[PDB]
Every structure is written in structure tokens, then in C-alpha cells.
């Protein structure tokens, strides 16, 4: 609600072009981040606009962050850095 | 000799004719390879009008009367040749399934999708039997056939108890639909099965008929379907006892699928919806609130 | 899975039974042999495990009566043991899931949020009502909840405007199955007497939300049971509320017919007998009953005033705009027009 309360400024300008970042505990809930992607539920997160354009960031991206440091540590330590 | 490759051949190929000229809308015209009169239709077949709500219960009362002419029928032989003018029997049947011709044209005409309306069961008995009968004339002779399809217009019953005021509640007319469904199935399974051994398999030479009533196959058929077996009467053709098995594993199947049904009737009795009478002379006086067991 | 299995047991009990009947048993020399062929041995073994028991068929070798009676109690442990398998299989039937056909030339809207009988059954009364004009506009539902025996046969008796379908608001692909997109507008009921009301304007707000986010300019008509929660609702981007994207507010609205007819007495129930769409009534008995019918026949109308009546010359023709058209009416708004 506050995102979209975001995109919905007006104070001269619009706020459409403010950044916005928004955490999300649910992936599924991207699609209503914006109006211009079309909706698609068997897209998966990475493929929809609002993650793709940076806009939206979930936890469940980081669910394969076990698998990537399992196959190489030092990637993580990366991270740490 | 026997006639009954008319009758057949006359409902298959109908039947195929049908499918063959529906799905050439889009197989032909793949990408290019009124409305007043057609809905006025779907005014009429539905039971808005009052002319809707007469239509169906003629239809019921001319199904009973045909489901009745076919046991008739069936207390006669499989098969002779007759005139038709000469008995009283083959023009009443005719009457009715020009009445029931004239329905599913209305609904034909009426029909959103003809496809999925081709695949309908009630313009399924329709026209399966109705070109035996018209046939039955251009031969001038008897064949029982299929025409114990007509039991299974009894589903609609329940349905014509909506307007008749006899029943007004809902659980009751679901138990109506319930027994009506079960009715229409075994006396349908009746009539295949008293077809089927009343005239020997072809292979055969139909040489292993076995005389069997109608009634007798019903009994059987109950008798069948408790469990019972009591081995008095079975099916001797090969194709009355693939189709004994067949039916055994589809009456099974059903019932089982029917257990919530008859949990969900049965014990959902009310308590009370009476009123008391007043024995004259005689007091009373109304406890009420808080009614526990102490 | 079941099917291969039973099947598969099925035909290698009766190939077994086959093998042991048509070679007697090895005790009597083989002089048991019955011409017995697999077909029929099929048969014995669907009319022993129904339980039908003929006795057309027997078994008439020591060998296979002991089998029959081992297997049979195999057979029925086996079926117990698969029937709670079947019995949770057969549960999962659908409904009304289907999708909703545009017709050519037809308006339709489409029903959503806290669907109940009662509900319904009043939304249907208020809108498809004999003294209004003949209401040609398709209905359609959706709900998360399969729809009870009374509410279908509710739909049957109102089969040519109203049908059912099976959805989720919040899911697209429900959306796009009973074009939203083709529909005139959107109609969201809220439950009213709900415990926590707050949640079920967030729910709502939610449902408008989803539905913009599929179809930007859509007509919206939602309940809101509070006034900062219409706030927050004024804030969706597409939410443009000029064109009729109306949020009835039940709270503020009742609140506000209490005040008015607190102000002057009795506003409130003419302000609802006006707005609803009554059939008038005439009762012959001579009691108030009859006039206060007569005066709540009145319904509410709206319509563009006309060249002769627009030239700078609005409360003027108010004066006596009434008595020569036999009717009442009240810039931006048209309230007691004066001087
Ligand atoms: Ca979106
Ligand atoms: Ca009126």
C-alpha cells in the first residue's frame, strides 16, 4: 500500500520516477508492485519486472545461497566482504 | 433371418453424422480454410415460460408412457413382422417420439455449442431411438432394441417437482434426485441385459438364447446388485456375462461414490418442526431459556 | 496406479486359477480336470470378489478351492487396505470450474469478495427488480468457497443472467476466466458483520488492488466499513474515482443519515425509501399504510437539463420548473438552486 502510495505522489512533480525498494515475504506478491508487467503467475520471481528492475527483494532468493556456498565457501566470505 | 442391422446402423451412422458435420466448424474453417430466432428457442426448452414449464412435464409423461409400451413390447417376442395400421401399439409410440423429435430440435436450434450439445445424454437416447422406430415402419417390423433408454429420462423428475408444489424441501428433493438416478440406472441395466440374452451372441449363431422376462432380468439385476447371488437365474451368453461384470464394477463404482450422498440424507433428521395440539380442557405451561441436561 | 494393480492381480489370479482347474490335482491322478476356459475364470473371479457368489462358475479342485479361499482373503485385505486411497481420491470433484464466454452485443459484470446466501439473495432482490426497466446485464460470481445447494438452485431459477464460476480474485489467471476485462465494472461486497472490521477493508483493499494491477480502467463499487481505510483506498494509482470508482462507506453513510435525521426527524428513512427501488403497492383499506406507499413510490433520477432551461436561467426556472413536469429536483452540484 505504501509503495503504490509512493508512486501516487504529486508535490509540484510525480512521484513515479521516486526509487523505491520493497521487502516482500511473499514472492507472489511482486506482480502488484507495478501496472505495466504483465502478469504472469508460472513466471518465476527473477523474470518479473519489479525484481528485474530492482525495485523488489524478497527472501527467497537467498534460499540457493546454501547450495552456492556448500559448492565453494569462498563465495560467501565474498559476501562478508 | 433378423432386421436389427437397420436399426443400428440407422443410430451409429446417425450418431456419426452429427459428430462429422459439428466439428467441421473450426476443422474447416481453420482461419478461414439469427440470434432472435435462436435464443427465442432458449425461451422455450427453458421453464421461464409458461409454455417452458408445460413442456416438461409432457415430456415426462410421454417418457412414462413409452418406458410402458416398451414393457409391453417386452412381454411379446424379440422380433416379428407386423402392419402397422393393424395394432394400436406402434403409431402411440410414434407420437411420442416426434414429440420428443420436436424438443430436441428446439433444442438443437436453441443449442449454444453444438458440439458439447451433440455429446448431451437426453438428445443421446433421442436419437437413439428414434431412427429404429422410424425405420420399424419403413420395414413394417418389431425390434425391442435400445428402446428401454427411455427409463433414463427419470433423472428429470426431481426437476418437475420444482414447479409442482407437492415437495418444498430442498434434502427431500435431493433424495428424490438420488432414488430417481437409481431407478432410471437399473431399470436402463435391465433392459441391456434382458436384450442381450434374449437373443444369443452372433458368433454363436445366436444358438445359446435363454428365455428370460423382463422382470426376471430385474429381479437378477437386484439380486446382483445386493451381493446376494443367489444363482437361481445368471447369464449364460458370453456378452451377458462380460456385461454382468462390466455393470457389477459400474454399480459398485456408483454406489461407492453415492456413500456421502446417503450419509448426508439419511440422519440429518430434524428434531421437531410440529406444533403442539391443545387437548381441551387440559393446561400447559412453556419452559424455555436455558435448556441443559441438569 | 490402483488401476494397473488391481488389474494386474485381477489377471494373474485368474490365469493361477486357469492353470490349477483345467490340470487336476496331482493326488487322483489328474482326474479332475474341468473344461474350464480363462474368459470364464475371469468371470468366476469378479462374480467371487464382488462377493455375488453365483455358484454358476465353481472351482471344483482341491487345489483351487484352497487357493480361492487364500486369495479371497487376500483380495479383501488388499481392498481394505486401498480403500483409504479411494476413499480420499473420489473427494476432490470440481464444482463450477470453468470460464466465462463474451457475448456479442451484451454487458455483464462480474461479483466478487464475502459471498453469502443472504448476501446474494439481496443484491439479487435490489438489482434485478420487475419495476426497474428490463435489466439485460450478465451476473457472474466468483468465490474461493464452492457454492452450496441452496445458492445453485438459486442460479437455476435465475439461469438466464446469473451463473457461477469457481476463482480466486487475487489470482490473474480466475481474472482473465470471467473477463474482467470485457466487464462494464466490478462489483466487491464486504462482510458487514465480520469481527475485526479492519481486516476485511485491508482484504478488500487487497482485492481492489489485484483487480487494478489486471485492468487499470475498470469500474470499482466496493464497501468500506471505515473512513481511514477509504483514505488509504483513495491512494491506489489507478484508483481515479471521476468516472465511477465509488467507495460506498457503510459506516459514514449510516452515521451520517443518524445526523441528518437528527437535524430533522424521519430523513433517514426517506432517504432509503427513495434510493431503493421499491414496487409500488396500493392497499384499498383507508389507513396510513396507503399514503405512506403512495409516498415511497417516489424513486431518485438524473438527466442533463435542456436548452431552454440552461441560458443563465437555472433557480429561476427552478421557481416553476415543477408544477408544469410534475416531478422534484435539487457548477460542480446541484443543491437548492437559488438566485
Ligand atoms: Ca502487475
Ligand atoms: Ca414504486
Not at chain 2, 432472435?36 to 408445460?54: C, E, F, N, P
Not at chain 2, 449454444?112 to 445424454?121: C, G, I, P, S
Amino acid at each position: 500500500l505504501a509503495s503504490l502510495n509512493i508512486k501516487s505522489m504529486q508535490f509540484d512533480t510525480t512521484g513515479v520516477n521516486i526509487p523505491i525498494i520493497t521487502e516482500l515475504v511473499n514472492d507472489t506478491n511482486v506482480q502488484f508492485l507495478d501496472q505495466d508487467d504483465d502478469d504472469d503467475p508460472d513466471t518465476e520471481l527473477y523474470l518479473t519486472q519489479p525484481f528485474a528492475c530492482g525495485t523488489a527483494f524478497a527472501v527467497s532468493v537467498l534460499d540457493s545461497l546454501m547450495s552456492a556456498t556448500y559448492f565453494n565457501d569462498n563465495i560467501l566470505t565474498l559476501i562478508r566482504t | 433371418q433378423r432386421m436389427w442391422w437397420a436399426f443400428l446402423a440407422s443410430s451409429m451412422v446417425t450418431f456419426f453424422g452429427g459428430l462429422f458435420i459439428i466439428l467441421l466448424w473450426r476443422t474447416l474453417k481453420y482461419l478461414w480454410t439469427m440470434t432472435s430466432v435462436k435464443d427465442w428457442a432458449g425461451v422455450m426448452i427453458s421453464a421461464q415460460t409458461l409454455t417452458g414449464r408445460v413442456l416438461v412435464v409432457l415430456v415426462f409423461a410421454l417418457s412414462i408412457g413409452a418406458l410402458v409400451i416398451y414393457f409391453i413390447d417386452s412381454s411379446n417376442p424379440i422380433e416379428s413382422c407386423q402392419n402397422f395400421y393393424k395394432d394400436f401399439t406402434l403409431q402411440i409410440d410414434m407420437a411420442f417420439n416426434v414429440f420428443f423429435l420436436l424438443y430436441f430440435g428446439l433444442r438443437f436450434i436453441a443449442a449454444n455449442d453444438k458440439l458439447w450439445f451433440w455429446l448431451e445424454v437426453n438428445s443421446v437416447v433421442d436419437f437413439f431411438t428414434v431412427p429404429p422406430v422410424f425405420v420399424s415402419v419403413y420395414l413394417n417390423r418389431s425390434w425391442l432394441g435400445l428402446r428401454f433408454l427411455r427409463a433414463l429420462r427419470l433423472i428429470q423428475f426431481s426437476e418437475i417437482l420444482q414447479f409442482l408444489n407437492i415437495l418444498k424441501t430442498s434434502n427431500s428433493i435431493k433424495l428424490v434426485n438420488l432414488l430417481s438416478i437409481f431407478i432410471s440406472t437399473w431399470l436402463t441395466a435391465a433392459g441391456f441385459i434382458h436384450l442381450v440374452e434374449n437373443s444369443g451372441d452372433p458368433w454363436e449363431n445366436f444358438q445359446n438364447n435363454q428365455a428370460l422376462t423382463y422382470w426376471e432380468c430385474v429381479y437378477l439385476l437386484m439380486v446382483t446388485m445386493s451381493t446376494v447371488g443367489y444363482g437361481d437365474v445368471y447369464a449364460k451368453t458370453t456378452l451377458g456375462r462380460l456385461f454382468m461384470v462390466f455393470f457389477i464394477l459400474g454399480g459398485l463404482a456408483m454406489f461407492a461414490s453415492y456413500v456421502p450422498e446417503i450419509i448426508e440424507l439419511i440422519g440429518n433428521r430434524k428434531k421437531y418442526g410440529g406444533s403442539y395440539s391443545a387437548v381441551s380442557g387440559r393446561k400447559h405451561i412453556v419452559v424455555c431459556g436455558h435448556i441443559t441436561l441438569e | 496406479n490402483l488401476l494397473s494393480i488391481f488389474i494386474s492381480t485381477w489377471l494373474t489370479a485368474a490365469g493361477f486359477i486357469h492353470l490349477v482347474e483345467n490340470s487336476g490335482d496331482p493326488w487322483e491322478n489328474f482326474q479332475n480336470n474341468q473344461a474350464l476356459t480363462y474368459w470364464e475364470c475371469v468371470y468366476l473371479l469378479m462374480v467371487t470378489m464382488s462377493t455375488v457368489g453365483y455358484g454358476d462358475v465353481y472351482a471344483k479342485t482341491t487345489l483351487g478351492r484352497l487357493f480361492m479361499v487364500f486369495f479371497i482373503l487376500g483380495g479383501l485385505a488388499m481392498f481394505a487396505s486401498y480403500v483409504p486411497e479411494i476413499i480420499e481420491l473420489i473427494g476432490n470433484r470440481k464444482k463450477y470450474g470453468g470460464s466465462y464466454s463474451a457475448v456479442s452485443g451484451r454487458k455483464h459484470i462480474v461479483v466478487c469478495g464475502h459471498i453469502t446466501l443472504e448476501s446474494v439473495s439481496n443484491f439479487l432482490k435490489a438489482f434485478l427488480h420487475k419495476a426497474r426497466d428490463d435489466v439485460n446485464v450478465e451476473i457472474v460470481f466468483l468465490h474461493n468457497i464452492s457454492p452450496n445447494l441452496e445458492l445453485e438452485a438459486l442460479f437455476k431459477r435465475h439461469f438466464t443472467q446469473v451463473e457461477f464460476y469457481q476463482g480466486s480474485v487475487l489470482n490473474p489467471h480466475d481474472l482473465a476466466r470471467v473477463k474482467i476485462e470485457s466487464a462494464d465494472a466490478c462489483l466487491i461486497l464486504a462482510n458487514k458483520y465480520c469481527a475485526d472490521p479492519d481486516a476485511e477493508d485491508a482484504s478488500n483493499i487487497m482485492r481492489v488492488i489485484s483487480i487494478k494491477n489486471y485492468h487499470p480502467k475498470i469500474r470499482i463499487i466496493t464497501q468500506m466499513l471505515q473512513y481511514h481505510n477509504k483514505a488509504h483506498l483513495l491512494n491506489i494509482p489507478s484508483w481515479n474515482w471521476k468516472e465511477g470508482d465509488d467507495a460506498i462507506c457503510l459506516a459514514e453513510l449510516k452515521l451520517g443519515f443518524i445526523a441528518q435525521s437528527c437535524l430533522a426527524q424521519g430523513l433517514s428513512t426517506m432517504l432509503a425509501n427513495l434510493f431503493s427501488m421499491r414496487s409500488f403497492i396500493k392497499i384499498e383499506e383507508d389507513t396510513w399504510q396507503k399514503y405512506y406507499l403512495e409516498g415511497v413510490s417516489n424513486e431518485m433520477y438524473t438527466e442533463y437539463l435542456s436548452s431552454a432551461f440552461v441560458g443563465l436561467s437555472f433557480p429561476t426556472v427552478c421557481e416553476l420548473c415543477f408544477v408544469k413536469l410534475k416531478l422534484l429536483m435539487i457548477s460542480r452540484i446541484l443543491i437548492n438552486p437559488g438566485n
